[PDB]
Design an enzyme around this catalytic site. Structure first.
Site, mmCIF file in Angstrom:
data_model
loop_
_atom_site.group_PDB
_atom_site.id
_atom_site.type_symbol
_atom_site.label_atom_id
_atom_site.label_comp_id
_atom_site.label_asym_id
_atom_site.label_seq_id
_atom_site.Cartn_x
_atom_site.Cartn_y
_atom_site.Cartn_z
ATOM 1 N N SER B 129 12.708 19.354 12.048
ATOM 2 C CA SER B 129 13.284 20.493 12.603
ATOM 3 C C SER B 129 14.863 20.368 12.191
ATOM 4 O O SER B 129 15.346 19.222 11.502
ATOM 5 C CB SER B 129 13.343 20.374 13.869
ATOM 6 O OG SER B 129 14.052 19.269 14.470
ATOM 7 N N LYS B 183 5.586 20.674 15.967
ATOM 8 C CA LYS B 183 6.595 21.251 15.379
ATOM 9 C C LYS B 183 6.460 22.851 15.626
ATOM 10 O O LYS B 183 7.545 23.370 16.122
ATOM 11 C CB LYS B 183 6.629 21.106 14.010
ATOM 12 C CG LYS B 183 7.687 21.946 13.064
ATOM 13 C CD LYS B 183 9.053 21.680 13.240
ATOM 14 C CE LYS B 183 9.951 22.555 12.874
ATOM 15 N NZ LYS B 183 9.113 23.406 11.690
ATOM 16 N N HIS B 186 7.474 23.383 19.270
ATOM 17 C CA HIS B 186 8.919 23.244 19.407
ATOM 18 C C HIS B 186 9.554 24.530 18.926
ATOM 19 O O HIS B 186 10.462 24.870 19.724
ATOM 20 C CB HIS B 186 9.555 22.106 18.716
ATOM 21 C CG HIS B 186 10.739 22.095 17.813
ATOM 22 N ND1 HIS B 186 11.848 21.828 18.554
ATOM 23 C CD2 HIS B 186 10.839 22.718 16.704
ATOM 24 C CE1 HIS B 186 12.653 22.219 17.488
ATOM 25 N NE2 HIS B 186 12.026 22.745 16.328
ATOM 26 N N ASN B 187 9.173 25.049 17.927
ATOM 27 C CA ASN B 187 9.695 26.512 17.411
ATOM 28 C C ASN B 187 9.501 27.584 18.665
ATOM 29 O O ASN B 187 10.335 28.403 18.709
ATOM 30 C CB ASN B 187 9.157 26.847 16.366
ATOM 31 C CG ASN B 187 9.528 25.841 15.194
ATOM 32 O OD1 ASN B 187 10.947 25.692 15.070
ATOM 33 N ND2 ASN B 187 8.872 25.417 14.404
ATOM 34 N N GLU B 190 11.822 27.102 21.452
ATOM 35 C CA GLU B 190 13.242 27.606 21.064
ATOM 36 C C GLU B 190 13.382 28.979 21.233
ATOM 37 O O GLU B 190 14.447 29.408 21.549
ATOM 38 C CB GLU B 190 13.313 27.222 19.541
ATOM 39 C CG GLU B 190 14.322 27.900 18.708
ATOM 40 C CD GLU B 190 14.505 27.329 17.323
ATOM 41 O OE1 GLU B 190 13.918 26.524 16.833
ATOM 42 O OE2 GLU B 190 15.161 28.186 16.319
#
Lengths: 481, 480
Positions: B129, B183, B186-187, B190
């Protein structure tokens, strides 16, 4: 001759059987085949009186007992089971023959299969069939995709078994290749939303208005007389009316409130995400099904989350009957938003795949043989009839006229529900989508700003074309990108 | 000697910045890129930053690596990444390590693992990231693969990772695609973090009437409290920027079309197939899709009836109580988004055999990431207290906060509706909250509807087994 069948069905599970019988009951000669012959024998023995069936113990007999151009329909489990049969029919079929998957197939597979099969000299149709087992027997909605030359031999056969509404066959050529299976999946998604909005109305009537289920049944029957007239609201009244013999309480109070989304609903909201379409109604509805099955998490959350200071209709000074009408208008608006999104998804699928799909056809053939059948569909047909290029069902003059009398009730419903802490996933998300569409400036402008700051992602400008970037780490001047 | 400890394949901005990260942190780094022009630009401009050993061919690149060989792939996700993998395995020795650092789908990573695992090699899928500045200055690195490989690989990764209070923002996540899976989550998180800031900015500008300059000043005030985050800090800058050309606030000149062309959607798709209600991340992705539908927006602007609308003045709402009520609605809506996000990790972890520790994620997301915020420490603490916590909302700290958030939460959804302003994540989050509290949800009705039209069976709260009602006949109940 009369020893040849006009259509054939491969795979004689309840669904394949019911569809063969439907072909036979409407005066078509129908060839039937199943790898395990036992199933075929049971169709002939128990249902052979319903018309003229031609049974085969082999694929090469089946194909030999069919008139030309040869129409065979596959009704086995979706995926590998299906591809098996497709290959078997092509090995055995002659050039110019038409192969049809009538199973519930992902539309991407239908495009792969249509390319390969057409290349092998044949013709491939993927055909969406709604109404589950009942529709398959007594009249389904058929949504077929493939070469338009194939509906010339296939069309009149399907028009003979399709649900009929005011003399019009609930079937028409959808468009090329996977268009049919695509539109069936959108229709499965727009049903989760229909079931969810009705749920929400029921919930507000039971917990804000204090109406028992027998009394809510009565309210749905009266709404079914008006603009909301639909097969789903009709049956919802039957369900709420039901009583459990064992306990004496409403059947709904004895059912575990856990409904899996183990179905097609999730495929609709995925293509929406891939086509960049805000299907908040179907999404919220699919999400609501997931949350209901979180048994361990709900058990632990029970009475353990703070509610806040909550009121009731009496303390608000709200008339019961005015609130019932408000829920009805919130229901209607939220359905319209759901449908406007669904038809947006259709238009985007159609453009992405060069399909040229007519929304009028879908709205017309969904009037029978499926769960979403409602008078409502006629106004969608009219709207596109008036303006082929309507940018949203919300902007149709009829519907825009309706929204004018819905909006205040809609706002009062979200406000009142929050003040009583009641779950309203679609009603509230639809209003936010509505107030989003009507807004001049959205908070995306600031999202563009954040992205340019942390990733030099670039932003466009209202006054000047192309991309731009601010030197955030640097002098804070603006440069072309 | 004259060998690199680590190698990077893919010399574009992510990759060149990563190779330059390793070098600046005193490792020897091999650099190879299919088109050799990029391999030159790097040595030409950043060759003075550290010891690079450039190669024109895959053979030379793999010849320059110390055993066990470690090469990180940083190229286009998809066919471009599957090719470099075969080119490497076709030149590597048994026991070598191939690491994919691109935004790979986690299902390709699980498959790539077994393909490479077979050939005697080890395969690592590593979420990186922090975009390009993080790739250079310190990323969060989420590696999935065989544990026995992190031993060789960890110390290299800890040497470049973002560092917070001396703890490196990298750790072994779990087997095969666990790293690429977190990951992707996590996006998705966001998007939700950015959308809730949007909704607050929208209610401060359209309900309170504050100009961008003033919204900036209140965002820096919130950054001193419980909401301290990199996103809010940069938001205040963006809001303070003035466009020189017109003199109007820079955000009044930006086309308000985000575009969901990113990996935010891959999160919702995964959630949808894992049976997890991702209403926060979902609505966030939906809002982006909507913002970009220009022609439908041009047509609907001023043509949809608003109804009767009020303002805060006529409601008799004090500006200062409103700005703090908005702060709490934002805090609660973000907390709903994180709880759903962490439920998706549990589910995905349980769907495979990953045993993912949520604590590792809240810890390594404190640096590199755009979502870095003080808030993550509370998620670490929540899972330290209860490893089997059913929802972040139930962790006693978070629950105590919600006690003081809920009344402001309800007033914001109510006030926004009465002013016709859009607040999707704020409203979706409250219905989800109120759904979690409900003893009886509408799914009871849905089961009834399905039993009627499809003989789709139902279950009962008293007896055990599946049951069906003969709706078309006797209307009696018969177990099936």
């Amino acid at each position: 001759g009369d020893n040849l069948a006009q259509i054939g069905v491969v795979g004689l599970a309840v669904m394949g059987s019911n569809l063969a019988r439907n072909f036979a009951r409407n005066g078509n000669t129908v060839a039937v085949y199943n790898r395990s012959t036992d199933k075929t024998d049971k169709l002939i023995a128990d249902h052979g009186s319903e018309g003229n069936f031609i049974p085969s113990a082999t694929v090469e007999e089946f194909v030999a007992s069919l008139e030309k151009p040869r129409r065979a329909i596959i009704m086995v489990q979706a995926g590998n089971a299906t591809d098996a049969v497709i290959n078997q029919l092509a090995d055995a079929m002659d050039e110019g023959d038409i192969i049809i998957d009538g199973g519930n197939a992902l539309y991407t597979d239908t495009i792969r299969r249509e390319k390969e099969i057409s290349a092998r000299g044949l013709h491939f149709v993927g055909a969406g069939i709604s109404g589950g087992e009942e529709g398959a027997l007594n009249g389904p909605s058929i949504m077929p995709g493939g070469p338009a030359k194939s509906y010339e031999s296939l069309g009149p056969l399907l028009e003979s078994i399709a649900a009929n509404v005011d003399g019009t066959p609930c079937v028409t050529h959808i468009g090329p290749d996977g268009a049919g299976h695509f539109v069936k999946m959108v229709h499965n998604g727009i049903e989760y939303a229909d079931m969810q909005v009705i749920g929400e109305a029921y919930h507000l009537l039971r917990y804000a208005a204090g109406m028992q289920p027998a009394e809510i049944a009565e309210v749905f029957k009266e709404w079914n007389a008006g603009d909301l007239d639909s097969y789903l609201i009709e049956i919802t009244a039957e369900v709420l009316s039901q009583v459990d013999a064992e306990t004496g309480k409403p059947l709904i109070d004895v059912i575990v409130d856990a409904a899996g989304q183990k179905g097609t609903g999730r495929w609709t909201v995925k293509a929406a995400l891939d086509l960049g379409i805000a299907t908040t109604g179907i999404g919220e509805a699919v999400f609501a099904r997931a949350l209901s099955g979180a048994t361990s998490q709900r058990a632990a959350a029970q009475g353990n989350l703070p509610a806040g200071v909550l009121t009731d209709l009496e303390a608000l000074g709200v008339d019961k009957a005015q609130f019932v009408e408000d829920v009805r208008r919130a229901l209607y608006a939220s359905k319209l938003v759901a449908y406007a999104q669904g038809f947006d998804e259709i238009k985007a699928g159609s453009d992405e795949n060069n399909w040229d799909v007519d929304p009028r056809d879908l709205a017309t053939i969904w009037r029978g043989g499926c769960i979403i059948r409602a008078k409502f569909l006629n106004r969608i047909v009219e709207a596109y009839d008036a303006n082929a290029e309507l940018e949203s069902l919300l902007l149709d003059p009829y519907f825009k006229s309706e929204l004018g009398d819905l909006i205040d009730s809609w706002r009062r419903v979200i406000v009142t529900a929050t003040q009583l802490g009641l779950p309203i996933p679609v009603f509230a998300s639809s209003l936010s989508y509505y107030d989003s569409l009507r807004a001049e400036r959205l908070p995306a402008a600031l999202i563009q700003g954040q992205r340019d700051f942390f990733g030099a992602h670039t932003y466009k400008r209202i006054d000047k074309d192309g991309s731009f970037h601010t030197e955030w780490s640097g002098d804070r001047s603006e440069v072309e990108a």
